[PDB]
């Protein structure tokens, strides 16, 4: 019931300003303190700070003191984290979390807001089909998601109906500065021709939403 829902991934150029949000529900908003934690790609967790919803009280760590700005909107039970001028070093995942009263650790966590600050132009991916292969056995098929920037991209199969056996690999950064990844599934060869498989690619930053139908060859 306790939920912390955060705004979507942001893509910004250095010098720009940014405001990401966190919406609390399923509990008394004013009774609990809210905090933020940054996590740069591949690295650990950094306590940004903590704040009261009811009044002024705020508590930043040293590294973040006067580098970011926390605030709250009691009327829509939402909290915020805010920069006046982003740097490329700011790109990272940012979690908001609720502080348990009478303690200092974080009760529940938001799902996080990916924040990417860069000068490189946003580029929408192109999606190609990886087609499979008396008969019967295991067949592999997938989708090649080429040349996009920045991360992330998203791949569901049959609109989420196909889950198990699906592998979306970590994106690889090519010399072109663009990203490429592949998503694949293994299925009984029996289904080839009877069931129909579609991968659903979504690269938010470039409003790219592609449904590609992967059917056997010839």
């Amino acid at each position: 019931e306790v939920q912390l829902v955060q705004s979507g991934a942001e893509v910004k150029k250095p010098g720009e300003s940014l405001k990401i949000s966190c919406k609390g529900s399923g509990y008394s908003f004013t009774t609990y303190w809210l905090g933020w934690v940054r996590q740069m790609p591949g690295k650990g967790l950094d306590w940004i700070g903590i704040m009261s919803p009811v009044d002024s009280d705020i508590r930043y760590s040293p590294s973040f003191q006067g580098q970011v700005t926390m605030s709250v909107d009691k009327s829509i039970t939402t909290a915020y984290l805010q920069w006046n001028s982003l740097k490329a070093s700011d790109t990272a995942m940012y979690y908001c979390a609720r502080r348990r009263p009478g303690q200092g650790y974080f009760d529940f966590w938001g799902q996080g807001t990916l924040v990417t600050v860069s000068s490189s132009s946003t580029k929408g991916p192109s999606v190609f089909p990886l087609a499979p292969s008396t008969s019967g056995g295991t067949a592999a098929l997938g989708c090649l998601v080429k040349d996009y920037f920045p991360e992330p991209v998203t791949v569901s199969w049959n609109s989420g109906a196909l889950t198990s056996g699906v592998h979306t690999f970590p994106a690889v950064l090519q010399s072109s500065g663009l990203y490429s990844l592949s998503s694949v599934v293994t299925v009984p060869s029996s289904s080839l021709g009877t069931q129909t498989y579609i991968c659903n690619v979504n690269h938010k930053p470039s409003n790219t939403k592609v449904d590609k139908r992967v059917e056997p060859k010839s």
Partner: protein, 214 residues
């Protein structure tokens, strides 16, 4: 601020083992320590607080002892879903601080890779590029060798490779080796093959195709 130093930085353990991560504070922090679990692609989950108390909702197999300056998190019967990196946190003095976390991976029996190869798509070729990807599915351990041959000639650094995180259910890996060319260079050569070597294999298995053959 108080520095939290966990150890090891990473460890591997078989299912059903007991595992023990430690966490030490540069200054006395009483019992104001918490442990978090973070699984890949997920936000952190709270396991333990005040050194030893289990969070409402987390399995009894997690526990945490220690007081003052040295603390330890224990998992009695390790399970596959427990693949994750764990962070401790002090809240005895502002600013609150985490450790660097420690990666826990699952150790299991050997499993051979299932190999697939996909030629370049017809559509892609119209865009002036050709990517041929080789799939290694569900293998253990992680150490695998892919080799690309074209017209039987060995390739050197013409393919980028990517691998998944241990599977939350079978502790298994999968990796994609992508050999990328231009439609130009692609047309010139005939036979494309990737040769996979792995501990689970008695001998190197290789999947190959001949260009433009329905």
């Amino acid at each position: 601020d108080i520095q939290m130093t966990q150890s090891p930085s990473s460890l591997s353990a078989s299912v059903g083992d007991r595992v023990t991560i430690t966490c030490r504070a540069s200054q006395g922090i009483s019992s104001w320590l918490a442990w978090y679990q973070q699984k890949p692609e997920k936000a952190p989950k709270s396991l333990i607080y005040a050194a030893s108390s289990l969070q409402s909702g987390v399995p009894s197999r997690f526990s945490g002892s220690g007081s003052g300056t040295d603390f330890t998190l224990t998992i009695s019967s390790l399970q596959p879903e427990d693949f994750a990196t764990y962070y401790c946190q002090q809240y005895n003095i502002y600013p609150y601080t985490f450790g660097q976390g420690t990666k826990l991976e699952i150790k299991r029996t050997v499993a051979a890779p299932s190999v697939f190869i996909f030629p370049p798509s017809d559509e892609q070729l119209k865009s002036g590029t050709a990517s041929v990807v080789c799939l290694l599915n569900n293998f253990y351990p992680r150490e695998a060798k892919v080799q690309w041959k074209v017209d039987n000639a060995l390739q050197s650094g013409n393919s980028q490779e990517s691998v998944t995180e241990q599977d939350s259910k079978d502790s298994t890996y999968s990796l994609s080796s992508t050999l990328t060319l231009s439609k130009a260079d692609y047309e010139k050569h005939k036979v494309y093959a990737c040769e996979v070597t792995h501990q689970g294999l008695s001998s190197p298995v290789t999947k190959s195709f001949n260009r433009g053959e329905c």
